[PDB]
Amino acid sequence: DVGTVIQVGDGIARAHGLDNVMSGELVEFANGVMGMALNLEENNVGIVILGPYTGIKEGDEVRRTGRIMEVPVGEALIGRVVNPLGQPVDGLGPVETTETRPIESRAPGVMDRRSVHEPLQTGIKAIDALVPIGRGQRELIIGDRQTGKTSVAIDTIINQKDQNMISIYVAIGQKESTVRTVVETLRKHGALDYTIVVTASASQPAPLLFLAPYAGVAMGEYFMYKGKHVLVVYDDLSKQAAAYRELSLLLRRPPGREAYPGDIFYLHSRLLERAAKLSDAKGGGSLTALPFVETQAGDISAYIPTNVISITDGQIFLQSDLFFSGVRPAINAGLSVSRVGGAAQIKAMKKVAGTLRLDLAAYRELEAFAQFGSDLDKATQAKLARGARTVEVLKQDLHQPIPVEKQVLIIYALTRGFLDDIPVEDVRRFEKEFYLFLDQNGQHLLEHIRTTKDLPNEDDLNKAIEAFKKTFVVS
Amino acid sequence: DVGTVIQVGDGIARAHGLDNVMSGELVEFANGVMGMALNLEENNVGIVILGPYTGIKEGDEVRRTGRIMEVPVGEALIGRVVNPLGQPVDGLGPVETTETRPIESRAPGVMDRRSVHEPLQTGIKAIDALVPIGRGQRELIIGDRQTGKTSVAIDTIINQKDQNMISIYVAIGQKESTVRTVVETLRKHGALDYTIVVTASASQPAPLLFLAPYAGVAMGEYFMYKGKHVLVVYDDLSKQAAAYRELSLLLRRPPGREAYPGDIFYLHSRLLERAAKLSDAKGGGSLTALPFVETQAGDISAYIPTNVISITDGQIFLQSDLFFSGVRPAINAGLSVSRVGGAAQIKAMKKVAGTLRLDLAAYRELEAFAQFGSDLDKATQAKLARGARTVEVLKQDLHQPIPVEKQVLIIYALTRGFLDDIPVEDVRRFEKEFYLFLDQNGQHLLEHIRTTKDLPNEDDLNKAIEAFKKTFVVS
Amino acid sequence: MTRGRVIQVMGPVVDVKFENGHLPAIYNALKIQHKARNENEVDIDLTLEVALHLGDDTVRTIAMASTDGLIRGMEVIDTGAPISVPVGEVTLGRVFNVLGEPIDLEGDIPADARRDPIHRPAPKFEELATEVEILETGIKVVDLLAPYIKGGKIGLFGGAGVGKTVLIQELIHNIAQEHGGISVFAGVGERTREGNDLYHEMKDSGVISKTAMVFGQMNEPPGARMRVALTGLTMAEYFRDEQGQDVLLFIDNIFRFTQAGSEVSALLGRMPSAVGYQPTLATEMGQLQERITSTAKGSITSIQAIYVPADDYTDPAPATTFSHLDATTNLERKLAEMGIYPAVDPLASTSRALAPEIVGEEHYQVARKVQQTLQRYKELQDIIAILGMDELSDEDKLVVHRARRIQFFLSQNFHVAEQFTGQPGSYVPVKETVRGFKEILEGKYDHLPEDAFRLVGRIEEVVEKAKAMG
């Protein structure tokens, strides 16, 4: 099984011989670079190169490894930074993995799955309260560039430190320097003992870019089949689509709409369908996917955005203008919907967020009218004050996730009008000092919420909040 | 003249040999399916298959029939249901036709024709009164799907029972079940003794779809050259265009606008130019065409619609919203124009429709204003009442064509304010009871209108209408 | 039989060469079965579908699953026929894939069971029916304002969470109960989560025994996503032809069938069309839907759920799909918030059957007279909002009074809702629906509380319930 290159250029090659090569195989060049064998012809083989091809010359010898694309997996990869292939990027020598899995594998069947019921705690008040997520779900986060998507991903991954989750972060087409900054930010908060990072920077060959999510999903599926919860994040799917378009065009594939090939829906569907909530017979493992899509000018109506929205079980829309105004993280009420939402939420969170939604929507529409008309009756004025306090409550500082129990406590304090006489600005400091008061006094409430997932007695909770209000000083 | 197939697929084939085949010939396969010989190459022949090609295999023998495409014609086809080729679809054994005509034939020259003067009676009050049609004319009926086009075609064909007309109905790409329903509806009213039905259902190969109108026009032209009036109807031209596009693309023809080939104007022009009003030397025969075009969202501005409008001598625009409101058939006053109109109409119909147009347009614009402003003077109020009565008069029940004389009588009754005190709802029942009163009493008026094509004396007509008004009871 | 050897592989496309002088037909199925001789090889078991003849004793095929591992010189066997699906009573209550294998963990179909090819010509002109016949579902508003017809296509237009599945299961239950007609559900290009939810919702309602399900989801290769509808169709066709009963066929999404066909055409090497669609779109859509017809022995009425991603109907797929439609039922979430079920829009729903030549005079009269009052109330509501009701004319007050009661009377206490709320379930005939609506209009049941009408079946229950309430 030996062959010689007869053509090379743009990252593709043609080889003579190789009589026994299998479709989808990996081949090793004379210098040592690896490639796929995508197309087999009557008398030549087409090869796709997954690295620097500058050293490949006509007449060079190419040999086949004897195996389909195999990404190594195992616990040995936790804390490392790896290529889409099984090679390290952070130094620290080799990984010494246990076993390998082919990236192109059949997804579990229908019969094999189960409904999503256990929640995923992001630690972001707005997301947890209004757009809940469950384990095994697939929710899309969509927005413009420089809107805070990666900040939300990091805040979510950090909050998983308490739970039993395993996390995987796949950087696609990102700048290497911000990837290094993100890795050092993860280490700074100590989240590296349960995470894996797979990277494919913008300077890499296009073939490596679309292969990254499949390596990520193979690594995640290794753990899930053994009964572990896994959370995979893709920061840039659209760049994977662009890299696949490039690779297809270099193969002279006739285009479609835009000039994307027909595989656009096939690619993303075959990728995102492997996130599931396995049945008790399989082992009960769960794999949650959080793909990110970047849209132009904030318009959600486009080929790739709507194509992905057709697949996912919901979406979160992040607005750029609100991001510039200082509100973090910006979320659009109208376009953010979750179809699994309401089943994952614990009882208290549901009981309070139900009122929270109505208050926020009423304030939104009333404010949308107020800019034109200033003549408002007492009821509308009280509604506006409530809405303003509500929108102030949902503010969150960077990289500081909040536990669910303090969220439900503060939102309960909001709903029942405990902030009637507290001015708007004092509300934030009210939240911090209330967290302190809960830490020193309300430990029983926190433990009850943790163990029981239910709201404590109204009278004792009101007594505690009243005591803190008695302590609190305005301005 | 024998050859062997070397390639087959998608309904096209390539054959070796066939040294003496002529362009445009029909060839018979070994199993018995028929095909065209469109393209001749240096060493192979291209064949287009007009039926189920699943049985055609490489190495099969193909022979040529020795003739150009010949559709059989004759009186033997009246009442039958036939393929685009000369083969029956209704059962009832073979047709036993007399002679055949090639579908691709030169149209009569200019010098050979004559102006259109004798009318075509549709039996639809609105069409006959406002958009008259003459024999030899070509008028396009355009509208959205589910707007009543086929109902208008059936109402027109049925009304031809009295006259000397021969009718042909060509179903293009239609559902077979609605074709069967239409045929049974034609038989129910006894219109099958003078009609011919050629069908090409949606499940048929694309080549048969574009060949259907040419078979229809050849069948119609057989009769016209012998001095008979013929009325051909095409329910769906746009599907013929789509089938031709498909066939061209399967031949790797480079596209144009949309991806229609350049032949789009050539196809429809070469088809519709054979409708004419032959001169006295040729024999005086006439062929009237009524092509139907389906447009999307009701917008008349598109490639195929405007392309066809460039050819026809006028168009009738059917509105979907009015069709849903219960008005049948819906017609748009603004976009419906006939350029031969005014020459075909008989004297009385012209004398009354002249006022009818003004009243309808005045009511249209006044009502378009009335929705915003309710302050109207006496004159505008009387104008609105007249317009409302006018729009109520033009209503027609399904599949019940009205003879011209009763049309002109009722419209005359309308114009002269014989409905001054009759309420709006009673107007329709007024029309029915007036038809009864004319049947029992006004026979002389009907016979005079039939023989003379002129309005009777005003005084006697007013006396008769006054007598009926004396008999009529309101509510 | 004849066995060929592979010569080319690329994506889902494979090419085979046959030496013995006999070559497969255009639609024949071929199978590859190879056991790995060494660790350098991989075990493969793949089914192929022929597409084209290319000369030099070679043929072209489209694969139904991933082609990884194929080698030149590998043998391919010809079955001699298209994809054969097992048909009969053995299919009820089981889930299949495209190839006719059971996905559900309840055993396998026996070897000797008869199997019929998926590809066959459509029924002919002579064999069709001659009169349009209404299909009685038993749902008040559906039968009143937008009747169904046997052999017709009904388009379902609604979003997730507006009650689609409740209506679907209610229709399956009613059709199985009265007319003795089974149903078939085919999933094409949908989320597997919704497939699991639908399966569990059917199992929790006792319907699964009366239906058969074929699933092809988003993850599947294009060829299976194309032919899943055809295998479901032949499963229903067996019941129509041999058993002579009426059948109801559900299709999850008509759009992705055309999308998969476009993908397969692009892979095959044909020149594109407008918006990059396949040139062969219309004939494929017709060949699928022209087998769904009402013959003498039986009929296959089909309910097709259509979802357009961009809400633009001018594209070739919505254009071609809408061309075959006969009726359209549109679901609105505003009435779901109001509490009316199944929340079909009375004003926006249409059917071509609502003509006196098909439904009769009284049905048309009552439908139009009801729709008049509904439109008047819809317009009058904003006037009621801006200006006080008391100042308005007596006629407008009467119109509102009748309209609210009529709008409430549209609702019906379904069968499947028996568990979430304790309800017997009502099945209403058309004639009593018409009589009840007419009597509501005339004023026989005028002097009753509007609360009574909220959830009732036939009209006498309204009086009994109102007397009980007060």
H helix count then E strand count, chain C? 13, 18
Pairing assessment for the beta strands C95-96 and C211-216 based on DSSP bridges: parallel
C195–chain A Cβ distance below 8 A for any pair:
yes
Angle between helices B176-188 and B149-159 (to 10 degrees): 30
Both tokens of A419, joined, read 């902030």
Amino acid residing at A101: R
The CA distance from C289 to C249, in Å, is: 11
One-letter amino acid identity for B9?
Answer: G
Q: Which of A180, A187, A339, A428 is catalytic?
A: A339
Instruction: Classify B282 as helix, strand or coil.
Output: coil
> What letters, b where the CB count within 10 A reaches 16 and e where it falls short, cover C203-235?
eebebbebbbbbbbbbbbbbbbbbbbbbbbbbb
DSSP code of A242? Answer: H
- Taking CB atoms and an 8 Å limit, are B9 and C290 in contact across chains? no
At A293, is the secondary structure helix, strand, or coil?
strand
Question: What is the SS3 string spanning C239-292?
Answer: HHHHHCCCEEEEECCCHHHHHHHHHHHHHHCCCCCHHHCCCCHHHHHHHHHCCC
Q: What angle do CA A286, C169, C341 make, to 5 degrees?
A: 100
Dihedral sign for Cα B294, B295, B300, B301, please.
negative
Asked whether the beta carbons of residue A110 and residue C195 sit closer than 8 angstroms, the reply is: yes
The torsion defined by the Cα of C228, C234, C235 and C241, in degrees rounded to 10, comes to 170
Query: Tokens at residue A196, please?
Result: 């894996």
Segment holding A6, helix H or strand E: strand A2-9
* d(C-alpha C326, C-alpha B376), whole Å: 44
Q: To one decimal place, what's the resolution in Å? A: 3.1
Nearest-CB residue to B201 (from C25, C27, C290):
C290
Per the CB < 8 A criterion, the answer to whether C6 and C14 are in contact is yes
Nearest to C251 by CA among C288, C307, C304: C304
| Contact status, residue C13 vs residue A42, Cβ threshold 8 Å | no
Backbone φ and ψ for A186, nearest 5 degrees, come out as: -65, -45
Q: Given CB atoms, is C126 within the 8 Å cutoff of chain B? A: yes
Nearest CA in chain C to B242: C282
- Tokens 């189920």 -> residue: B52
Question: Which tokens hold the place of B447?
Answer: 């016979």
Longest CA–CA span in chain A (Å) reads: 87
The SS3 call for residue C359 is helix
Cβ under 8 Å to C: A residues 208-227: none
Whether residue A335 contacts residue A443, with contact meaning beta carbons closer than 8 Å, is answered with no
- The closest alpha carbon to A235, from A257, A212, A219, belongs to A212
Selected residue of B44, B80, B155, B176 to mutate for chain C interface (largest C Cβ count, 10 A): B176
Is A371 in contact with A416 (CB distance < 8 Å)?
A: no
C352 among annotated binding-site residues: yes
CA-closest candidate to residue B275, choices B267, B283, B285, B265:
B285
- Specify the 3-state DSSP secondary structure of C325: coil
Nearest CA in chain C to A65: C40
> How big is the A-C interface in CB pairs under 8 Å?
108
Closest CA to C329 of C311, C351, C312: C351
C199 touches chain A (CB under 8 A): yes
In eight-state DSSP terms, residue C34 is: E
* Other residues' Cβ atoms within 10 Å of the Cβ of residue C175: 22
Instruction: Flag whether residue C358 sits within 8 Å of chain A, measured between CB atoms.
Output: no
- Widest CA span in chain C: 93
Name the token pair of B76: 């033997």
User: What's the CA angle centered on A282, arms A281 and A284, to 5 degrees?
Assistant: 90
> Closest Cα of chain B to C184: distance in Å?
22
Tell me the β-bridge partners of A49.
A35
Do residues C132 and A139 lie in contact, with contact meaning Cβ atoms separated by under 8 Å? no
For residue B141, the Cα-to-chain-centroid distance in whole angstroms is 7
Give Rg (Cα) of chain B: 26
Which residues in chain B have their CB less than 8 angstroms from residue C23's CB? 57-59
Query: What is d(CA B38, CA B29) in angstroms, rounded to the nearest whole number?
Result: 15
SS3 per-residue string spanning A87-153:
CECCCCCCCCCCEEEECCCCCCCCCCECCCCCEECCCCHHHHHHCCEECCCECEEEECCCCCHHHHH
Residue C467: Cβ within 10 Å count: 10
Known binding-site positions of A for ADP? 338-339
Instruction: Indicate the residue of C9, C219, C275 with minimum beta-carbon distance to A269.
Output: C219
* Integer-rounded Cα radius of gyration of chain C: 26
Enter the tokens of residue B235: 């329910």
Is cis: bond before A261, omega within 30 of 0? no
A 10 A CB-CB count for A178 gives: 13
Residues of C in contact with A104 (CB under 8 A): 66, 68
Token code pair at residue A422: 């507290």
Contacts (Cβ under 8 Å, ≥6 apart) of B470: none
Residues of C in contact with A19 (CB under 8 A): 72
**H/E element, A66:** strand A61-68
Residue C240 CB partners (closer than 8 Å, separation 6+):
C246, C247, C295, C297, C298, C299, C300
Q: Using the 8-state DSSP alphabet, how is residue C88 labeled?
A: S
User: How far apart are the C-alpha atoms of A25 and B432, rounded to whole Å?
Assistant: 83
Q: Where are the alpha helices (DSSP H) in B22-166?
A: 125-130, 149-159
In chain B, which residues have their Cβ closer than 8 Å to the Cβ of C126?
89-91
Token digits of residue B200:
């090409």
CB A273 within 8 A of CB A112: no
Structure tokens at C339: 């509490």
Bridge-based pairing of strands A337-338 and B286-294 is unpaired
Q: How was this structure determined?
A: cryo-EM
CA distance A128 to A405: 11
